[PDB]
Scaffold this active site. Structure first.
Site, PDB file in Angstrom:
ATOM      1  N   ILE A   1      34.785  44.299  44.168  1.00  0.00           N
ATOM      2  CA  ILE A   1      34.314  43.270  44.888  1.00  0.00           C
ATOM      3  C   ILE A   1      33.179  43.683  45.603  1.00  0.00           C
ATOM      4  O   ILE A   1      33.318  44.530  46.467  1.00  0.00           O
ATOM      5  CB  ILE A   1      35.431  42.506  45.616  1.00  0.00           C
ATOM      6  CG1 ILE A   1      36.632  42.064  44.752  1.00  0.00           C
ATOM      7  CG2 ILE A   1      34.989  41.877  46.510  1.00  0.00           C
ATOM      8  CD1 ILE A   1      37.806  41.554  45.624  1.00  0.00           C
TER       9      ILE A   1
ATOM     10  N   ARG B   1      43.503  45.611  36.324  1.00  0.00           N
ATOM     11  CA  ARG B   1      43.501  46.902  35.779  1.00  0.00           C
ATOM     12  C   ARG B   1      44.909  47.350  35.219  1.00  0.00           C
ATOM     13  O   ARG B   1      45.001  48.147  34.572  1.00  0.00           O
ATOM     14  CB  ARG B   1      43.073  47.787  36.891  1.00  0.00           C
ATOM     15  CG  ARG B   1      41.664  47.787  37.411  1.00  0.00           C
ATOM     16  CD  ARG B   1      41.529  48.736  38.637  1.00  0.00           C
ATOM     17  NE  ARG B   1      40.181  48.605  39.035  1.00  0.00           N
ATOM     18  CZ  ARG B   1      39.655  48.512  40.236  1.00  0.00           C
ATOM     19  NH1 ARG B   1      40.750  48.173  41.213  1.00  0.00           N
ATOM     20  NH2 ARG B   1      38.579  48.728  40.574  1.00  0.00           N
TER      21      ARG B   1
ATOM     22  N   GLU C   1      43.065  44.801  41.185  1.00  0.00           N
ATOM     23  CA  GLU C   1      44.353  45.923  40.455  1.00  0.00           C
ATOM     24  C   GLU C   1      45.062  45.330  39.356  1.00  0.00           C
ATOM     25  O   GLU C   1      45.720  45.901  38.788  1.00  0.00           O
ATOM     26  CB  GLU C   1      44.950  46.239  41.893  1.00  0.00           C
ATOM     27  CG  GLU C   1      44.119  46.944  42.923  1.00  0.00           C
ATOM     28  CD  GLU C   1      43.524  48.527  42.344  1.00  0.00           C
ATOM     29  OE1 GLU C   1      43.575  48.699  41.327  1.00  0.00           O
ATOM     30  OE2 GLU C   1      42.845  49.140  43.430  1.00  0.00           O
TER      31      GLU C   1
END
Ligand SMILES: Nc1ncnc2c1ncn2[C@@H]1O[C@@H]2COP(=O)(O)O[C@H]2[C@H]1O
EC number: 3.2.2.22
Length: 246
Positions: free
Chosen positions: A71, A163, A160
């Site tokens: 970000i 991912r 996250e």
């Protein structure tokens, strides 16, 4: 762009947002069936815009670097906000140009720096969809200490989860009740760069990690990852950081 609305959100709609987020990140190849993020993208194309809406329908737009899912900054009404780091300053040449003013936050987007600014480490900050509602609300109006905590929630519930399938599923479990991240959640966040590097190196080493990675598993136990047949490689990790950016 991708969007997520907390009003009427459920595990299914959050899962669809995380699928949208993964699918917006470009890749030219897969390594052991995992999309390999690009080494570089020139110009405005480097940045994905995520439109996030709180329960009340108020919105921020978040800029995400598509090479590393970092970000960079966000837009709230007529003010842009960027991390205090060179990648975010460069992002501010391309995104949210039409903001009336641009604030540089008094920290980089590094977890260690955000945790110092927030006054708490990630292990003590509850995450979930309610927490993401609170984070969007916090970021609508400048408060740099509150924003640090809100950004730690935002990063873990978007990037996250993109991912790692496990982290997506942990946020789905927290759809209506926040809870501090699991030991495995923190372990995976900390290990993404290392796992990305070892999976790429395993091409040329018969699927064998040149350096094994120590993780915490979904039961809170140590697991040593030595090769690409591991559950973390076959099911969990969804995106690889390009070794050129490590
Ligand atoms: N602009 C950012 N700069 C650095 N790290 C970021 C940024 N935004 C989010 N993060 C997260 O902060 C983390 C610190 O290093 P990580 O390997 O754990 O992976 C990173 C990202 O998940």
């Amino acid at each position: 762009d991708v969007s997520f609305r907390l009003s009427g959100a459920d595990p299914r709609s959050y899962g669809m947002f995380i699928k949208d987020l993964r699918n917006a990140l470009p890749f030219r190849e897969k390594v052991y069936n995992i999309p390999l993020l690009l080494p570089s993208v020139s110009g405005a194309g480097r940045y994905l815009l995520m439109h996030l809406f709180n329960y009340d329908g108020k919105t921020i737009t978040v800029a995400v670097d598509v090479t590393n899912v970092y970000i960079m900054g966000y837009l709230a009404d007529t003010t842009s906000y960027f991390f205090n780091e060179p990648a975010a300053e460069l992002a501010s040449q391309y995104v949210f140009r039409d903001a009336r003013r641009k604030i540089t936050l008094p920290y980089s987007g590094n977890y260690e720096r955000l945790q110092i600014a927030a006054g708490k480490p990630r292990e003590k900050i509850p995450i979930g969809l309610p927490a993401l509602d609170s984070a969007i609300s916090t970021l609508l109006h400048y408060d740099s200490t509150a924003a640090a905590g809100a950004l730690l929630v935002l990063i873990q519930t978007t990037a996250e989860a993109a991912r790692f399938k496990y982290i997506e599923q942990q946020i789905q479990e927290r759809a209506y009740r926040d809870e501090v991240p699991s030991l495995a959640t923190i372990s995976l966040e900390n290990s993404w760069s290392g796992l990305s590097k070892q999976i790429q190196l395993a091409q040329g080493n018969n699927g064998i990690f040149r350096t094994p990675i120590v993780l915490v598993d979904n039961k809170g136990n140590r697991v040593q990852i030595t090769n690409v047949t591991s559950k973390v490689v076959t099911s969990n990790i969804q995106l690889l950081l390009n070794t050129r950016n490590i």
